Amino acid sequence: MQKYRLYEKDGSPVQDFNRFVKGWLDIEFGLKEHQPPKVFDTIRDKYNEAIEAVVLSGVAPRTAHKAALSTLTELLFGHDLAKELSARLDIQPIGVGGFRSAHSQAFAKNVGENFVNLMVYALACILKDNDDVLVDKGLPPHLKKALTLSRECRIKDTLREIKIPIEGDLCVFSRSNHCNAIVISAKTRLKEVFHIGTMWALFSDVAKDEYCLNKWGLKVESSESLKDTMYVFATADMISQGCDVERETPRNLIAMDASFFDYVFVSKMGIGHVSSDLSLKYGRESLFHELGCIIDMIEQKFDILL
Amino acid sequence: MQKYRLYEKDGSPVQDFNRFVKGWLDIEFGLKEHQPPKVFDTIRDKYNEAIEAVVLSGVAPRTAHKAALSTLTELLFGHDLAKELSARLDIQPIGVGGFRSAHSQAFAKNVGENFVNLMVYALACILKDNDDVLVDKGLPPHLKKALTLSRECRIKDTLREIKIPIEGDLCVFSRSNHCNAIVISAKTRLKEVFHIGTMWALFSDVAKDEYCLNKWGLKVESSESLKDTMYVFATADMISQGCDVERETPRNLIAMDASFFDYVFVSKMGIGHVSSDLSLKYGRESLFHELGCIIDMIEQKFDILL
């Protein structure tokens, strides 16, 4: 299998970036920076078949991807996504199928990574004709080092340099500025693990504030650069006591976790408290947005049209 | 079963506090603020039998409790604690026994709460003749409200007041000042859940800093009062890939989590990087201290002798 590289040895992203990314998830070729996706073939095709079905019904491609993103939880459950998108967009009642492979152990053991893969693919598809705004699973080299804090802690006699690598599952960033990015953390569920994200959500705030850098004795490569670095969370709310996002009002601890993120997206639609509108100008509408609103977020932030 | 109350209706702790606490764990009587301990009877007796055995060997009571605290992980595994304390203190090789009940499902389902119970009991025993410095499972009412942050977040039309209750599993506090306390978070293991503690460890810092209060739009009852509020973590390192604390050098993410706590105690002894000395005057010796050092921490902080 032929393998290419997304980034040059300096860290610069190769031209027509979103092409190599989409090809990697299409398994048209492997990549240097990434291992081939696992049991992603079926759900990737089921996604595209839904987009093809909706688009051929006069619906704009942007409208399709944005609607599919806000309904990815269905595709992850192996349900007929196109039957879902059609009902919402009120076009001709479509059937693409759904897939038994969803109920397999291999799929259930890779659903977490496939959720990340679905978002990367959906974004790569809509950004395929754009080489200014890029998308990649995980963080680009330059941003991963910029989001890495440092700390020196006393271990008896000697001193231990401690690294604080603020994580991200996927990233939408600018070619001319890798810090001008949207870092996305993704989990299929929230539960109490959401607190872990809040810690990272706080550190991303901390890394931008020279006062906070000093209070906790932290060293960052450049705090001013991270000014344009947005830090968000994306969840499928896949779920017992029920769900965490899909309810009349989210629980207090869940609400507080989402509040310290810049934005929190969910791949569900029709939830009362969840905002379907996203305007960077007028501020965060609610604690939870529909995942499709990330398109609007990308458009406004990077000043492009999809 | 007769039930008493640790706190009056105003919030003031009843006189001879540590007596009612020790009695509750002795199940001499129930309490209003606490439900009776579960499957704690066996391990509580096995603890005392070890202290009785060591003390009757000329060893001072303070020396016993401090050594037992730094070896609680053994008592939680159902091992012969007195055979362990004797070997360390180099007195007459003792046998108290150990207990089969450790390998029971009921004990395994309550080991997490019993770990908290063991620490509360051990501290209650050593503080039984002190009515100035108190110990209680969880936080006292006045401190629980003082450690509760507040935040207003926009939910579309309306505004949602969000509570941020900085948690604690047990607390050692002053009667004349409940904020002058040692808040202790306790888990039998660290793993990735330790990040959750780091979030709380950060919020405790945040709650003390009027700048940080304002940056994140947070309201606290009194930030100045929490100045004397110490926030620590206690773990049994009970453990595969091995342990997290019991190794030559703890993993990076584990180290960074411990670093944002004021102190981190472990109920193990003989670990190279773990400090057996604790001096508030000369600062935190290492990221991990022996749990027995919390006695020294209590003594120095509250200016008492045990």
Radius of gyration of chain B, Cα coordinates, nearest whole angstrom: 20
In terms of CA atoms, which chain A residue is nearest residue B149? Answer: A256
Kindly state whether B212 is in contact with chain A, defined as any CB-CB distance less than 8 angstroms.
Answer: yes
User: Could you tell me whether strands A263-266 and A289-290 are parallel, antiparallel, or unpaired per DSSP bridges?
Assistant: parallel
Q: Would you state the structure tokens that stand for residue A283, as one six-digit string?
A: 């501020």
Residue in this structure with the two tokens 């490569």, named with its chain if needed: A221
Cα dihedral: B32, B33, B37, B41 (round 10): -60
Q: Which of A43, A12, A38, A10 is nearest to A24 (CA)?
A: A38
**A218 to chain B: which residues are within 8 Å by CB?**
none
Nearest-angstrom CA–CA distance, A53 and A91? 10
Residues of A in contact with B287 (CB under 8 A): 153, 155
Which residue's structure tokens are 């960052």? A220
Chain center to CA of A19: 18
Give the amino acid at A265. F
CA gap B9, B206 in Å, rounded: 30
Q: Which residue of B has its CA nearest to A209?
A: B215
Match 């908290």 to its residue by tokens: B116
Cβ of residue B12 closer than 8 Å to a chain A Cβ = no
DSSP state of A13: B
Let me know: does B275 contact B258? Beta carbons within 8 Å: no
Residue B52: count of CB within 10 angstroms of its CB: 14
- Number of neighbours of residue B163 by Cβ within 10 angstroms: 12
Q: How many CB atoms lie within 10 A of CB B247?
A: 15
Q: Which residues pair with residue A134 across a beta bridge?
A: A173
B25-43 in b/e form (b: 16+ CB < 10 A) is bbeeeebebbeebebbebb
Contact criterion met (CB < 8 Å) for B259 and A151? yes
CB contact under 8 A, A198 and B199: yes
Q: What is the SS3 assignment for A164? A: strand
Q: Do B215 and A212 touch (CB under 8 A)?
A: yes
Domain borders along chain A are 1-306
Evaluate whether B192 touches B125 at the Cβ level (below 8 Å): no
Q: Which residues of chain A make contact with B273, given a CB cutoff of 8 A?
A: 155-156
Candidates B151, B152, B159, B162, partner chain A, best to mutate (most A CBs within 10 A)? B162
Task: End-to-end CA distance of chain B: give it in Å, rounded.
Answer: 32
The phi, psi pair for B78, rounded to 5°, reads: 80, 10
Q: What is the spatial distance between Cα B147 and Cα A50, in angstroms, rounded to a whole number?
A: 50
Residues B36, B10 contacting (CB under 8 angstroms):
no
B5-11: long-range contacts, CB 8 A cutoff, minimum separation 24: B5/B31, B5/B32, B5/B33, B6/B31, B6/B32, B6/B33, B6/B34, B6/B136, B7/B33, B7/B140, B7/B141, B11/B140, B11/B141, B11/B142, B11/B178
Say what angle helices B111-126 and B61-69 make with each other, to 10 degrees: 160
Distances (CA, A) of A100 to A39, A46, A115, A259: 13, 12, 17, 37
Long-range contacts formed by B161-166: CB under 8 A, 24+ apart: B162/A252, B162/A255, B162/A256, B162/A259, B163/A252, B163/A256, B164/A256, B164/B203, B164/B218, B166/B200, B166/B203, B166/B204, B166/B207, B166/B231
Structure-token match 């959500």, residue found: A201
CB A93 within 8 A of CB A83: yes
Closest CA to A170 of A207, A129, A222, A122: A122
- A160 lies within 8 A of chain B by CB: yes
H helix or E strand, kind and range, residue A232: strand A230-235
Q: How many of the other CB atoms lie within 10 Å of CB of A299?
A: 16
Q: Which residue of B has its CA nearest to A288?
A: B155
Helix (H) or strand (E) holding A290: strand A289-290
Helix (H/G/I), strand (E/B), else coil: A217: coil
Interchain proximity B164–A256, CB inside 8 Å: yes
At A228 the three-state DSSP class reads: helix
Contact across the interface for A156 and B209, Cβ inside 8 Å: no
Torsion on CA atoms A263, A268, A269, A275, rounded to nearest 10: -10
Q: Which amino acid is at A100?
A: R
Residue B302 CB coordination number (10 Å): 18
- The CA distance from A123 to A127, in Å, is 6
Query: Number of C-alpha atoms within 13 angstroms, CB side, residue A82?
Result: 23
Dig out the tokens for A86 from the structure: 């059609």
Partners of A164 on chain B (C-beta within 8 Å) are 256
Q: What is the C-alpha separation between B304 and B298, in angstroms, rounded? A: 8
Q: Retrieve residue B278's tokens.
A: 């604790």
List residues bridging with B30 in a β-sheet: B3
Preceding residues of all breaks in chain B (C to N beyond 2.5 angstroms)?
239
B228 touches chain A (CB under 8 A): no
Q: Alpha helix (H) ranges present in chain A?
A: 17-25, 41-55, 61-69, 72-76, 81-89, 105-108, 111-126, 141-146, 194-206, 210-215, 252-259, 293-302
Strand partners, A266: A235, A290
In order of A57, A63, A202, A301, the CA distances from A60 in angstroms are: 9, 5, 38, 22
Partners of B137 in the β-ladder: B170
Cβ(A218)–Cβ(A206) below 8 Å: yes
DSSP string for residues in chain B: --EE-SB-SSSPBPSSHHHHHHHHHTTSSEESS-PPPSS-HHHHHHHHHHHHHHHTTT--HHHHHHHHHTTHHHHHTT--HHHHHHHHHT-S-------GGGGSHHHHTSHHHHHHHHHHHHHHHHTTT-SSEEEEES--HHHHHHTEEEEEEEETTEEEEEEEE---SEEEEESS-SSSEEEEEEES--TTTHHHHHHHHHHHHHTT-HHHHHHTTEE-S-TTGGGG-EEEEEE--------SSSSSS--HHHHHHHHTSSEEEES----TTSBS---TTT---SS-EETTHHHHHHHHHHT---
Residue A78: partners with Cβ closer than 8 Å, 6 or more residues away: A98, A99, A100, A101, A102, A103, A107
Helix (H, G, I), strand (E, B) or coil at A30: strand
By the 8 A CB rule, do B75 and B118 touch? yes
Residue of B nearest to A150 (CA): B256
User: What percentage of chain A's residues is helix, strand, coil (to nearest 5)?
Assistant: 40, 20, 45
Q: Tokens for A83?
A: 């039957």
| Residue B277: how many other CB atoms lie within 10 Å | 12
- Chain B residues whose CB is inside 8 A of the A163 CB are 252, 256
Measured between CA atoms, the residue of chain B closest to residue A198 is B199
How many other CB atoms sit within 10 Å of the CB of residue A7?
A: 17
SS3 of A129-162: the string is CCCCEEEEECCCHHHHHHCEEEEEEEECCEEEEE
With beta carbons less than 8 A apart as the criterion, state whether B134 and B127 touch. yes
Nearest CB to B255: which of A153, A196, A209? A153
A255 to B154: CB separation less than 8 angstroms, yes or no: no
- Inform me whether the C-beta atom of residue A150 falls under 8 Å from chain B C-beta atoms: no
Note whether B165 and B207 are within 8 A (CB): no
Residue with the two structure tokens 């207090």: A252
**CA A55 to chain centroid:** 23
Residue among B155, B215, B286 whose CB faces A287 most closely: B155
Between CA A185 and CA A204 the distance in angstroms is 12
CA angle B141, B146, B152 (to 5 degrees): 120
Compute φ and ψ for B41, nearest 5 degrees.
-55, -50
Question: Bridge-partner residues for A182, per DSSP?
Answer: A172, A230
Question: How would you classify residue A39: left for phi > 0, otherwise alpha for psi between -120 and 50, otherwise beta?
Answer: left
What residues of B are in contact with residue A252 (Cβ under 8 Å)? 162-163
Tokens of B302: 């509250």
The first and second tokens of residue B53, run together, are 């055995």
First-to-last CA distance in chain A?
32
Residue B261, token pair as written in the block: 């706590």
Of the candidates B110, B4, B238, B193, the one whose C-alpha atom is nearest the C-alpha of residue A196 is B193
In order of A47, A61, A91, A302, B72, the CA distances from A57 in angstroms are: 16, 10, 7, 29, 68
- Which of B143, B120, B131, B139 shows the shortest CA–CA distance to B43? B120
What span, in angstroms and rounded, lies between the C-alpha atoms of A21 and A30? 9
- If you count them, how many residues does chain B have? 306
> Using CA atoms, how far apart are residues B70 and B290, in angstroms rounded to an integer?
6
- Report yes or no: A285 at the B interface, CB cutoff 8 Å: yes
Residue of chain B whose Cα is closest to the Cα of A216: B260
3-state secondary structure of A43: helix
Alpha carbons B49 and B80: distance in angstroms, whole number? 10
Tell whether A219 is within 8 A of chain B (Cβ). no
Token digits for A206?
């901390």
